[PDB]
Every structure is written in structure tokens, then in C-alpha cells.
Amino acid sequence: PRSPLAGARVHFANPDDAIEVFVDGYPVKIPKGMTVLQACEVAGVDIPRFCYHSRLSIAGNCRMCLVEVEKSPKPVASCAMPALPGMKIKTDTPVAKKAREGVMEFLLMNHPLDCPICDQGGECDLQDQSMAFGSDRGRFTEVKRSVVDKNLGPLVKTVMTRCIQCTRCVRFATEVAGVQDLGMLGRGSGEEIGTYVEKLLTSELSGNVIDICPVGALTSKPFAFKARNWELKGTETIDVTDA
Amino acid sequence: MDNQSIFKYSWETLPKKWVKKMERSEHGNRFDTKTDYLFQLLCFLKLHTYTRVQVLIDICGVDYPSRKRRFEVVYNLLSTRYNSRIRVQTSADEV
Amino acid sequence: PYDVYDQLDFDVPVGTRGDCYDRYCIRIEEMRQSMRIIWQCPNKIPSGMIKADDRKLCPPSRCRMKLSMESSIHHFELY
Amino acid sequence: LNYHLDSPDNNPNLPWEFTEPNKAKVTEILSHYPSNYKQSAVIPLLDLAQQQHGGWLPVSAMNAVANIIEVPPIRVYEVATFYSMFNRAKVGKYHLLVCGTTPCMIRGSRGIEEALLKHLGVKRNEVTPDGLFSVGEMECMGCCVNAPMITVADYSNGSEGYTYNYYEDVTPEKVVEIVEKLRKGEKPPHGTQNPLRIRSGPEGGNTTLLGEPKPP
Amino acid sequence: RRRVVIYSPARTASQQGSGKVGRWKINFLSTQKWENPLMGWTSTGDPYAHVGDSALTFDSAEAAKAFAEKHGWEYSVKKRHTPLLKVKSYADNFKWKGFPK
């Protein structure tokens, strides 16, 4: 008796057989090749993520969804980990807690410090994930790294100072959008995301890019600084422009 | 860590006919009872020569607009002689 | 005794025949006991920190908020 | 260095291609992979472009190779900017790279670096004008059991004559001699500068495999 | 009397959390605002301008429906979309194209 997150109608392509895994104790049923992250979801516990979107491909890139699966070595990336019958998942063990604390420590270490001007402040994943799962004190004094901002037409302006190298935008632009312009170039700490020939992005779904990109770097230009999120009310309607 | 004595004695000697829920937390000890015996229960207290409360501190209402029994009446009352306080919390609907 | 009050012994006067005069004398004796406490504090006040050790229930001070990074996140979320 | 082209005076998007022998070599290079996956050939092809433009690698060349392997140019940009052996800053006719890492530092490389830099007016990834001599620094290039080394890349005749050779067992006087011999003369015999030792081992009598091999 | 709409607010399109989904909530579709001529603040005259989504948060569509029916004002329940759960695979990410045609 444990409803999945948000309600999530699992498929059961072959409903005659389906594995079962122990998530934090009590068991849950799972289709053949479902990932550990979706198994935890079905069990009803959310796992912090940055570089995993249910509509794009997987990439163990942000390294924040770590859990410990007993019957295994120390760390495990939840996503991209295909569930096995009987593995002993565990999410709230000191190992996982410290893993999350350290990773958030590194992100917020080499992040910029401009929340009170950076819109998506009040909506930011990185912000909420840090406040809920990360530590409370930073230990860092030396100079950070900063890059120059970029223009991508009059729809998606970017202050790339805060491009935390998730490749969500890259994977979207190469899988769902269709046009391959965005790309991650550079090395090490000096790694930017930007078209190399200062071109624009002549495709639709770029608003979908600005929704995908969690931290507030790619943001809608015509909604530059007009409001935070906590200020305005949302009504759920349909569209009439398209068909 | 405050008044386990009075609460334990009161529960172990009460007529167990009219107690619907007991919670011995550390925030406050709760005797959730039925609205039909409330006067009976309170008159048991204030008179029994061990758990005599003798002072009623508060009668507050709480509103839960999602349950069939919409309201929640709560009586916070202490025992100045036995240095203890208990919270008798009853349910109550519209009329 | 919710707070430090133990280490702060005092008197707690009590009236013998409840009426206006005895409540009045109680009030004056309570003034004097409060003076006893107000002196006992500045003789024991243990110079140290204040208000917290977690910048998740208490906001960080100005220097940290404007120098460190996670201090700004916590100040923002907390306000 | 940088991660965004700035389109200088005469290098925005001028037309750029290969020669004819370079076309033949391009076919030969492209003939080593499954035709479905030709993206791999991006690593050798890129290099060829260098040897055709003097270690330059202009943006039109990246576009040309991206067109020759049928890929959106951003992937070729990624490849050409992630690695380290590709330069995009028109180094001089001769590039001089000095190694730095602990097993090669503690043999006295910093001296070679400082002396080579002082003999010219350059500043460590800078171009001595009359635009011969570019100098720069690199991480461990292997062979760090031999000596403090100095590698020289020669872009003189283009695809032919381009030569990327080491120079081991060096001392600042030998280095200044070598660089001026490169200017005036043409080619100094590379190697290890009078190896009283045997390459990649001891000095004099090698203490292994003394007389003759033998099939087991 | 007033027509009300009982829905469950969908997940925000900016974050990736889940602590705010599956929470039945009634809104009074009240929109009668105007611009205060002196300063420019947004005036109103509806007593139910904000209560429906400021304090009235219900546990389930059944409870919210019974409550609206009790106070009498007529309602019209909406639907709740839930994410379908497919199966993913890093191998499917690194699939293999066929032989040359």
C-alpha cells in the first residue's frame, strides 16, 4: 500500500512476469528493465536529480542521485542502474547522505553568487536541492571561474557563468528539437556550452530548452526580470494558436 | 519527561469505556475521547484524589476542512497540586 | 523552569489573604526579585555565540552572506 | 586560447579546401572504418588540415572537414577544441614545446624553458615575429625516463616536410645552438645529443640482453 | 451562488520535485480586478479573491466534492493527468546502427 509519486501508471508490457525489489525495506513490483530511479519512484521516494529528465536519454552526469544498493560496493548512481531482482536499495543511509552533501558542496563551490538577480531564484532546482539535502556552511575563499555570457536570438538569453555542465540542453537539442547547434566544448573547469560560430537557434521548442535547463542560465528574454514565481498565480488552460 | 506519573495513573484506573485514543508524546499527553462522555470524564478528574486537575487553562477549536468530523475541540488543563497538565481532545461536527 | 532560571535562584513571594493590598505587595516584591535576577545575569553571562549553529533555522550574518555562496542560498530561502 | 571564434580580418569564413594529393590522402584515411561510422576519421583529418595551413586550423577548415564526413559542424568544433594537440592561433613556422611534470621537472626543465624564452622576446605560447618562432609548454609527453626534453614541430613545406621530432638530453646552450641552427641552417639531426647512454636505459654497458637474443 | 472548479494543480514546469502534486484544490474562477487610479495597485471586490487557493487545500477529490456540495455552490470536477512510466536503458542509449546499406 504505497502509491507512486504523482501517480504513475506503470506499463507491465508482459504482465505475467515482473521483478520485485526492496526499496528502503518494504518491497515493490517493477517491469523487466526499469531503472533504479524509477523503482524508487514507484516505491514512493523522490531522489535528487539534475541531469535526468523523463523524456531525454539518461546520462550519469550530475552525480547527485546517489543511493546505496546493498549487495554492491559503496556508491551507486540511481539512474542508469538497471534494477535487479532482490537488490537491497537504500536511500537514507549515512553513505547516501554524505554523498549528496559532498556533491552539493562542489556545485555550490564553483557556482556564481548572484541569486538575488538571477531569476529562477525561487524556482531553482539547485537551490531547493541544496536547501533540502545539502549542508549549511561553505568552506571556500579562493577565486571562482567566470565565463562570458552568450546570445541565442531574442528568445533564450544566457548568463553562462552558471552552466553547471549537465548537458540537458545538449541532449534535448540533439534528440527532440532536431537541429544540432548547441554543444559542450572545452575541458576541465573551463568547459562552456555554446555554438562555436556565434550563430542563433532557428528552431522551435527553444522555450522548451529554457524550461529544461534547471539552473537559471538559459532564460526567456521577453520575461527578463518582470517577476519571481512566488508572486503570480497560474490557471490551467489549453491553447488556441496551434491546432 | 514531565508528567508520566499522572497520565499513567489516570489511564490505568479510568473506566476504559470512554477513551478512544491515548497519545503519550513529549509535546503533550492526549486523551482523545468521545463527545458523549466528555462531561463524565472531566468530572472524574477534578475529583479523584490523585489526578485532581482543578483548573482548566484553555478550550480551543481547530478546523480541518477535509474530514467528515470537521471540527476539533481541545481542552488544555493542568493540575496545580500534582504539577502536570493533560489535553483532552474531542471531535465535533457541524451542528 | 523553561530557561536558565535554575542557575538564577530567586524568591517568589506569596500573599497570605488574597486581596488588593496583598497583590500590591506581591508586585513590589516581584520587582525586587527581578532586580536580583537582572544583576545575577551580567555576572554570569557567558560571552560566546548567539542564536544558532545551523544556517537552516537561523539566517547567516552579513559578512558570510555576502562572501560565501551557500550562505546566500540559505539566506534567500530563509527570508 | 579561447572557446569562441572572433572572426578576424581575413579569417571569418573564406573558402577553404584541400589540394589534390591531400584529396587522395583524405580518401585513404576515410577508407579505414565502416561507412556508417565515419565520424571517427575526424581525428586524423583535422590533423591533416593543420599540415596544410601552418599549424593554423582555420574555421573554414573545420567546416570543410565536417562537410566531408557528413556531420553538423558543432561536433567537429567539439573535437577540435577538446583535445590539446590542435592549436588555433597561427603559431610561427616552427613550434617549440617544452614538457613539464614532476619526473621531468626534477631533472631541470625550468632552466631550458627560461633560457629559450630569454634568448628571444617571446612569452611562453608567443610568436617571435618575422613569424618564425612560436614557443609553448605541454604536459608529460612520455619518454620521461630519458631527460628534460624539447619537442619541435616544423611547418615549413606544408604537408611534405612537416616533421614533429623530439630532442632529449638538452642543456640551454645546446638549445640556443639548435634554435639558431634552425633559423640559419635547415635540419639538425634529432635524437639524444651524444648519448653516452643507450636510449631508454642505462649508460655504457646495458645491464640486460647483453650478447644475443634467442627464440625460446 | 458561484461556479467553482475542482482540480489538482499539475507539477510546475520549472522544477523537478514532487511535493506539490496530487493535492485536490478548489478554485473560484473569480477575475474582476482593475487598476486603482491613484497608484496602480490591483483592486478587487470579490470576497473569495484568494481564499480558495490560499487556505482551502483538500486531501482528495471526494472530500473537496462533498465540501463544495455541502456549501451548495455548483461545481465541475476536472481531470488529473499522471505521467506514464516507460522503461529506459543506458544500453538503448548506446544502441548499434546496422550494417552499411
Place this chain on the structure above:
Amino acid sequence: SNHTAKWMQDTSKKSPMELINEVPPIKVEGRIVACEGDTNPALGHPIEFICLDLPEPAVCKYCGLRYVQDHH
């Protein structure tokens, strides 16, 4: 022209934008700077490390000071 027209009314003394354009660039020496003024607290403007690899000045996003790299 439009923002200062929306908020300011006097249009006799110069608007904030006009003053912050009247201040010239800084012409710093290295490649990265940090803008606060001259104190760490009591002057706000948290650390805002900003790159300087473009032939045009770089604004600071608080109290735009337009730092510029000096040499090549």
C-alpha cells in the same frame, strides 16, 4: 529614456544610468576581477567574478563598473 521615464519624474538632474555611464572603465591588469567597492561588508555587492576576454568592457551586474583588461 523609458525606464528612467517610468520611475523618475524630475528629469533635471542626471538619472542613475547617466551617472554610471559617466564613470569611465577601470583598466585592470589581469584576467578576472571582483566588484564590491572598498569594503567587503557595509557596501554589499557580493562577489561577482567576471571574465575579461572580449575587446569591449564587461559590466558587473551590480553597480556596473565596466572593467577592462589592460594589455594584450
Place this chain on the structure above:
Amino acid sequence: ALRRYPTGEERCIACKLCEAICPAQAITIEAEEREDGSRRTTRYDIDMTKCIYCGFCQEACPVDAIVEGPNFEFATETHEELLYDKEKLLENGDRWETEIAENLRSESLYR
């Protein structure tokens, strides 16, 4: 008062933090991207009455934009005044910019 940098450049950056923490909701603030690029406030007003004087303003501000100067003699004869205008009169708080400054220095240590 709304201070500004020594360069004459305004301090406020429209975080909405003061408006969010206002326990009396006595602040209204509405911003827009300026022409030069930086973000500033198009309208900022505090209807002083509804603004009980609690202090949270000068604590929520990450750039010390808004502050409470030590002036208590403003006893106008018409409500509209105490509805301090759209940042304009608030900007004129800079007529105390010296005095206020002093206070801030003496509170940089323990605050």
C-alpha cells in the same frame, strides 16, 4: 531610504526579497530590464502607514539598498504623503546619505 553606490549608481536590483518578507505587505515593487542591460525597479513604493516599522527590510536586502534612517519627524497633513511615492521620494532619502552611512559603519561589526 534607498541608498546608492558612491558612483551615483542605484543599489536596488529588484530581488523582491523586501516585498516577500514584508509582514504587512506594505511594499509594491515592479521591475523590467533596462535599456543598457542591468535590471532595476520601475515602481517601488511603501505606503508608510501600512508599513509598521519592524525592521525586516534592512535585514532582507543583500545589497543594503533599503534602510531605515534615524529620522522620525515626518508628520504630513494628508494621507497621500504617508503613501511614499514610487521610489522617487524614497530616493530622496539620500539627503541623509551621510548620517545613515555613519550608522551602517557602526553596525558592520555586530550584525
Place this chain on the structure above:
Amino acid sequence: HFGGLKDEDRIFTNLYGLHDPFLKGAMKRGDWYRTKDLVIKGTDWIVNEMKKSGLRGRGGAGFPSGLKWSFMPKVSDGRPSYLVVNADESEPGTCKDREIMRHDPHKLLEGCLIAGVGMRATAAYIYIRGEYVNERKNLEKARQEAYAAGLLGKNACGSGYDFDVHIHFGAGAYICGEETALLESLEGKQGKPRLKPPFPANAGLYGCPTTVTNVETVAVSPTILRRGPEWFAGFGRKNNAGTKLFCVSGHVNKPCTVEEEMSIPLKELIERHCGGVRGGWDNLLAVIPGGSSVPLLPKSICDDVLMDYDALKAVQSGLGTAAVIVMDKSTDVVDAIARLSYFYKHESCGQCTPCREGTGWLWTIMERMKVGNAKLEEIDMLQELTKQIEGHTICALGDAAAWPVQGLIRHFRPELERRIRENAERELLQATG
């Protein structure tokens, strides 16, 4: 058993290349003898033989190569199979594979063929390093001569086994040394690693089953498979056996690279084959047994430690690539460690955040500690950061960036504390004026 390896048991009889070219048209003495029989003796026999020998993978992991080859799909399939040789040695201090490739290439080629058969592999790619233009020229000449002689191709030697081998230029980076990042950079994309749950035995190079083996093991494979696995197991120790070539360089009189048997006392190796240290156990301060990715070994420890996969692995370190470095008493050990950490900063490509950020941070802290501009709680913070990075990265370059500083603040705390104290005293003395 002990150290000291006779001349006849040695394998790489070319490591110096004077009377012995690459093409082996003059020196076919060693290789290509009867590979026809060794491939028509079936693949399962080859895997059994390797498992019986004990060839712990000489790349930096130590996996039992028998299992690693047995992991490939036994029953046939559709999509073909690929072997890939990881000739991308660029860990600072290793100069063995360079000599193997430059002087004795046909060893690597025949080993590639025999391992491709032993893995039911269809093709095989050797990923050379970038700045090896002359070595690459020699290797490519050798491969062309092997194709010309008909010894590597459709009918490999006399077997019906089809096999194509291909060289690939290197890039210039170092993360390409890793398994999955090697497969990636061979595809054509940037040199970044993959996630392990799709192990490169069912989803590898092109998605085909493809395994990556270091040039060491695949180059030693022919002679170990020919001379019988007992002659191989008769070396080293019980669980660690074989002949490995060390590349000793740093602060010795004679910097060298020579092949010995495992479990050889460092004293014996250094004092016997290489030149004795400038002062034999007198001014020798530190020793790094493995590559630059292995915690230190102070003087007191390394006097009597064996050199294998377990002895120093039990002490604290790991043999890794077996590139022993020595450092005298007149070389700032903290400066050497800082330089290594700077290298690791300059090589971590930066897919996932822990390695990238933490490595920049480690370099900064190590510089500040080199000058002496820190406190003691800062060295404890260094240990903490080390632990976090080591735990939670994608693959072993995080451990690489974490291990040396860990070993440093493990075996060298007193001198570091002394540096800090002296800087503090000098700062106070200067501030008093």
C-alpha cells in the same frame, strides 16, 4: 618467488633495439612462429589457458585477464565483436609501451590476433597516443608489412578466421586512457567516459561487444600462451605471478626501464638493475611505487616491501602501472605533490562535477600548502575533500586525483606542519614591524 630475473626467461628481447629492427624480416626469431595452431586450437582452450596462467591485467587495475576475456559472449550473435588495445599510456612516469611499440611491434600485432580469436572478436583497434609520430610511423610500417605477408587479414595465417586490425591516432589528452572514454574517443566524439552498468562486454565500441585491454597483456599473450602457463606461474608469488617491466626514473644515478619478476624487493631492483640511489637509503626521502596515481611510500616503509599487486597493496599503495619514482632528501615533496595535482587538474575532462571542481580545489590548496599559507584544520579539510572525491565520481580518475594527497598527508604530516608553523612565525615577526 624472490627478485633477479635470468636472461633466458625474459620476454621483451628488444627493449633497446640495436641489432634488432621492427620488421622482423631480419628477426622473425621470436614471433609469428605457429599462430596457426594457436588459433585452430579453439577459443575456449585459450580462455582456459589464460585463466590457468594468472595474467593479472597490467593496466592499472589488476583484474584477472582470464575472466575479462571470458566475459565476452560465447554463443554467436548478429553484430560483430571488437577488441581494442589501450596503447594510450600517458600516466606521468611510464615509458615502457613507447619502447614496445617503437621496437617490437609484431609482438603487439600477433597478440592482437590471438586475443581477438580468444575473445571471438571480429576486429581490433589499437589506440596509439597522439605525440608518437615516429613510433606511429614504425608501427604502421610493421602493420602494412604484416598485411603484405598475408599473416593478418581474411585467412589470418592458415585458419579460416577473418580479422581486421586498425591503428588510430591519438589526441593529446590523458583521460583517453580510460576504458570507456577510449571507446568514446574512438567513436569520434569527445574523449569522455561512460557509465559502467553497461559493461563493455555487451555494449562497447559501436554498441557491439568490445573489450579493452592494455598493450601490456595483449602483447605478452603470445609468448605466455606458447611457452605454457606453468613457466609463467613459476614467477612472482602465489596469487601475483608474471614478469613485468618497470620504468624507474626520478632521482637515481641511472634512469632506466627493465623487466623483472613480481615480488622483487625495491632495494634489490634499484640497487641491482637501475643505478643505486645517489645515497643508498641515505638521502632517499620518498618513493612512489605505481604511477602518479598511487599514494607515497616513505623511506622507513619501502626498505623491505615486495613489488607485486598485493604486498604494497597491503601496505597502503597500489602497483598500478609500476612506474616507480624516487625522490631525494633535497626535493620539496609537497612541491612534487602539488605539481602532480596540477597535472590532474589539467587532465580531468570534467563530465561529472566531483572530479572537476574538487581537482581545481585540490591544486589550489596544495599550492597554498607548498608556500605554507594555511593552517592545520586546512590539512584535515584536505583529507575530507580527498575522501569525498575518491568516493563519488564516475570512474578512477577521481581516485587518481584523491590518492597522492591522501598518502602525502598520511605519511608526511610532521614536515607539512613544520612548514605551516614556520610561515606563521615569519608572518608574525614581519607584522610586528
Place this chain on the structure above:
Amino acid sequence: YDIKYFSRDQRRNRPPIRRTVLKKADVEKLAKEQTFAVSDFPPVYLNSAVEEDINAIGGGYQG
């Protein structure tokens, strides 16, 4: 210098709420096994007046 937020934040590290139901069987069992004693019923919190002076404490000074 050793930030570690769970061990510091023993908050949210509280045990779960434990519930139990009782029926007539358990009620009867507890009623039978239970037995009072002459002592430890509850304790009593007794306190009385003393009629103390004013100038006593610390010569009537310290506090």
C-alpha cells in the same frame, strides 16, 4: 572546518510514530496483570509559605 549536516541536524532524525490498537482481550489482560502499591501512586508537588525576612539574603544585598 568539519561541516556535516545530518550529524549536526539531528532534527529530522527523530524516531517514527508508533501506534497500537487494543481489544477486549488485551484490555482484560492488562486489567488483571495491573496491581497498585502503597507507594509510587503519583508523587505530590508540595510547597508552603515560610514567612522569611527581607534583609536576610547576603546581608540583604547580593542576589
